[PDB]
């Protein structure tokens, strides 16, 4: 368990990217952990892809948040193929050790937010990590 916010995204060159997050609320009080999904009301997600963590870093791209099926908790984060091309343009020429197709493009993090659901701006970061562009061959 503990914390696992750090996960790295590998986006594909020349292909639009879309991620599907099934938000969930597991509780291990009872031995079969409760599968209750969180209910997505007054929730907005924001995420930017910025090269390096230093202050003043240029914004490589910005995630486009989608909220669908609020009852069952799922949500989608995506960005158009034009955003993918803009990301791939500024990616470094050095390739990842384990995969000779990925190249480090920047860092990211998405931040959930409650906007005055109880007169509170309860915004906290969901996940984080590095964004990797995977060089394509089709185009």
């Amino acid at each position: 368990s503990t914390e696992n916010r750090v996960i790295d995204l590998v986006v594909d060159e020349n292909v639009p990217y879309g991620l599907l997050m099934q938000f969930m609320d597991v509780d291990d009080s009872v031995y079969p952990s409760t599968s209750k999904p969180v209910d997505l009301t007054d929730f907005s997600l924001r995420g930017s892809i910025k090269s390096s963590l230093e202050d003043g870093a240029e914004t490589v791209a910005s995630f486009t948040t989608a909220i669908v099926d609020a009852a069952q908790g799922v949500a989608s984060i995506s960005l158009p193929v034009s955003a993918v091309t803009t990301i791939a343009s500024k990616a470094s020429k050095e390739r990842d050790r384990y995969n000779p197709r990925q190249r480090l493009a920047g860092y990211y993090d998405v931040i959930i937010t409650r906007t005055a659901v109880g007169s509170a701006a309860s915004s906290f970061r969901i996940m984080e990590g590095k964004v990797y562009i995977s060089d394509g061959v089709t185009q």
Binding site: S1, T2, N4, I7, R97, Y98, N99, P100, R101
Partner: protein, 298 residues
């Protein structure tokens, strides 16, 4: 006459009618023996001194091979023969053992001058390799039922292991967060079969050889050794508490063993520099354990 040198040998595994000559073999060890029934019939009439020993069975052989990783990935067939399901170049640990009996194959140990030792009814019972700061090598352990001496044999001219893969430092991740201060990642996979001895009264005055066996269990295991490192006071990520379920992957440039959900137990040793030791096994409901085999360029 003709002596038999280990360095001048060739080990060919016969499966499905094709010879898998396993080159890039660092070292192998094998032995053959027979089972005896030696009883001493000392009686009040004659307190004898000479036993009644008859050879009636062949003791199963225990052959161990040490095989270097190769670019053609013939060595993954040992996982394939041991019971793992295959999709592409990745081997899955099935949720349930597929069949009652293991996958049987024959093996030859060729030598000069048409000399050979023929191990039959073999099965892969153990495969373990240590990802460390030395060149990785997987020690496979097979058990035979019948051994024999034959004149002509099967020699794998075409199916052979290529060049050994260059060394690459191991790294273990949780999702995508690296685990610091790795020392030695050792992985272990087993097919703990058991011989079904069916020696009966119809085999009297004959030499019996084991023929059939059943799988007691399959498992995937890994022991990870770290240095006790903490980044914060009262840290939550790095501590000694057990982890019921956590995604783990022991990754290399050419192989990556994946535990979709792992049960980790920690053990601290107060040595010269404090070392923690993990005991990683997949959970009850975890997805099949992955073993990817990347030849070159992933």
């Amino acid at each position: 006459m003709f002596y038999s040198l280990m360095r001048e040998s060739k080990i060919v595994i016969e499966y499905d009618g094709r010879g898998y000559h396993f080159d890039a073999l660092s070292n192998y060890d094998a032995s053959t023996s027979f089972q005896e029934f030696k009883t001493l019939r000392r009686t009040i009439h004659n307190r004898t001194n000479y036993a009644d020993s008859i050879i009636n069975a062949q003791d199963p052989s225990s052959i161990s091979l040490a095989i270097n990783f190769s670019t053609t990935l013939i060595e993954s067939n040992f996982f394939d023969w041991m019971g793992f399901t295959r999709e592409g170049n990745s081997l899955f640990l099935p949720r349930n053992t597929p069949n009652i009996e293991p996958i049987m194959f024959n093996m030859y140990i060729i030598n000069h001058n048409n000399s050979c030792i023929y191990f039959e009814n073999c099965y892969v019972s153990t495969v373990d390799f240590s990802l460390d700061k030395s060149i990785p090598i997987l020690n496979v352990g097979i058990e035979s039922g019948k051994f024999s001496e034959v004149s002509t044999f099967r020699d794998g001219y075409t199916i052979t292991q290529g060049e050994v893969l260059p060394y690459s430092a191991p790294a273990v991740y949780t999702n995508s967060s690296p685990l610091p201060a790795l020392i030695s990642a050792s992985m272990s996979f087993q097919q703990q079969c058991s011989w079904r001895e069916d020696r009966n009264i119809f085999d009297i005055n004959k030499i019996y050889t084991n023929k059939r066996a059943y799988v007691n269990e399959m498992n995937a295991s890994a022991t990870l050794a770290f240095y006790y490192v903490k980044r914060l006071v009262g840290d939550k990520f790095l501590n000694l508490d057990p982890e019921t379920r956590t995604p783990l992957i022991i990754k290399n440039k050419y192989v990556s063993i994946t535990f979709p959900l792992a049960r980790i137990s920690k053990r601290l040793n107060f040595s010269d520099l404090y070392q923690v030791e993990y005991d990683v096994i997949p959970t009850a409901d975890s997805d099949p354990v992955e073993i990817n085999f990347f030849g070159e360029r992933k």
